[PDB]
C-alpha cells in the first residue's frame, strides 16, 4: 500500500526504500527530502554554549512534537497523491526552518536580537506565529536577569547597564 512507508519517513525510522510506473521516485523525493530535515533537527536540538540557546532549543521541541502529533493522526490509509498535497502547505515550512538554524550560530543577546530581525523581515506571511512562539520563549530566561535589577537605540542601552547595578547594590544593603 506504500502509505505506511511514506508516512513513516517524517518520523525518522528507516524503511525498505528509505535508506541512510517509474516516475514515483521524483514524487517520492519531494516527500523524502522533507524527512531529511526532521532528522537534521533532533541531531541539532537534543541537548537540554549559553542559557538563552537552551531555551530556544527547549522551545523548538515544543513545536516538533506538534508536527509529530499532526502526523499519525488523520490518515489511516489515504491516496498516494493526497499525501503530497496535504504535506505541501506544511512541508515547505519545515524546509524554511533549515534556513533559520544551521542545518556559526549566535548566542546571548546576539541571538535574542537576531531572531527578532527575522520577524519584521517576514512578518505578514504565514511564518509569523511560529517565529513568535519561539521568540516568546527564547527570551524567557533573559527576562529573569532583567527581573533582578528591578541595532537598538543607544539612548536606552547604557541606561540599562546602570539601572541594574543599582538594584544589585541595594540588595547588599
Amino acid at each position: 500500500e506504500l502509505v505506511k512507508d511514506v508516512l513513516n519517513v517524517l518520523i525518522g525510522v528507516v524503511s525498505a526504500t528509505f535508506s541512510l510506473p517509474e516516475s514515483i521516485s521524483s514524487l517520492l523525493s519531494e516527500v523524502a527530502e522533507y524527512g531529511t530535515c526532521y532528522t537534521r533537527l533532533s541531531h541539532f536540538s537534543l541537548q537540554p554554549k549559553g542559557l538563552v540557546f537552551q531555551a530556544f532549543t527547549s522551545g523548538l521541541r515544543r513545536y516538533l512534537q506538534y508536527y509529530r502529533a499532526c502526523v499519525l493522526s488523520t490518515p489511516p490509509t489515504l491516496s498516494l497523491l493526497t499525501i503530497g498535497f496535504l504535506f505541501k502547505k506544511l512541508g515547505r515550512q519545515l524546509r524554511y526552518l533549515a534556513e533559520l538554524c544551521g542545518v556559526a550560530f549566535p548566542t546571548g543577546v546576539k541571538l535574542l536580537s537576531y531572531l527578532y530581525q527575522e520577524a519584521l523581515h517576514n512578518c505578514s506571511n504565514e511564518h509569523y506565529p511560529v517565529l513568535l512562539s519561539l521568540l516568546k520563549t527564547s527570551c524567557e530566561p533573559y527576562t529573569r536577569f532583567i527581573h533582578d535589577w528591578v541595532v537598538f537605540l543607544k539612548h536606552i542601552a547604557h541606561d540599562i547597564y546602570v539601572c541594574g547595578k543599582t538594584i544589585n547594590l541595594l540588595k547588599l544593603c
Binding site: 513513516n8 518520523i11 525510522v13 528507516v14 524503511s15 512534537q65 509529530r68 502529533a69 499519525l72
Partner: protein, 121 residues
C-alpha cells in the same frame, strides 16, 4: 548503568526506536535502587527525606504505566504513539537518575547533600 538485549531477528525499523524508549527504564533502575539503600539510618536525617520526596514521583510513574495498559487493551496504543506519551517521564526520570548518581559518587550526608540540591520545568 543497565544494559539491555532486544532480538537477533527483528525488524530494523523497530530496534532503532526501541533504543529510544529504554533510556527511561535504565534511568529508572537506578532511582529505585537509590531509594532502597539511602533509606538506611547510617546516612543522616537528610539523605532520608531526600529519598522519601524522591518516592512520590516513582508512585506517579507507576500510575502512568497503569493508564497505558488500560489504554492498550482497546488497541489504541501503537508503538509510535508510545514514544510521545512517556516524554514527561523521560525528562523527570532523567533528572533524578542524575542526582542519585551524583550524591553517591562523592559520599555526601547532611549539609553536603543539601548543597548539591542547590547547585543542580
Amino acid at each position: 548503568s543497565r544494559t539491555f538485549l532486544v532480538d537477533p531477528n527483528l525488524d530494523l525499523s523497530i530496534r532503532e526506536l526501541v533504543h529510544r524508549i529504554l533510556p527511561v527504564a535504565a534511568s529508572y533502575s537506578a532511582v529505585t535502587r537509590f531509594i532502597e539503600e539511602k533509606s538506611s539510618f547510617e546516612y543522616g536525617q537528610v539523605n532520608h527525606a531526600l529519598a522519601a520526596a524522591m518516592r512520590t514521583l516513582v508512585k506517579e510513574h507507576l500510575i502512568l504505566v497503569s493508564q497505558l495498559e488500560q489504554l492498550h487493551r482497546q488497541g489504541l496504543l501503537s508503538l509510535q504513539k508510545l514514544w510521545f506519551y512517556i516524554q514527561p517521564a523521560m525528562r523527570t526520570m532523567d533528572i533524578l537518575a542524575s542526582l542519585a548518581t551524583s550524591v553517591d559518587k562523592g559520599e555526601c550526608l547532611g549539609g553536603s547533600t543539601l548543597s548539591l540540591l542547590h547547585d543542580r520545568q
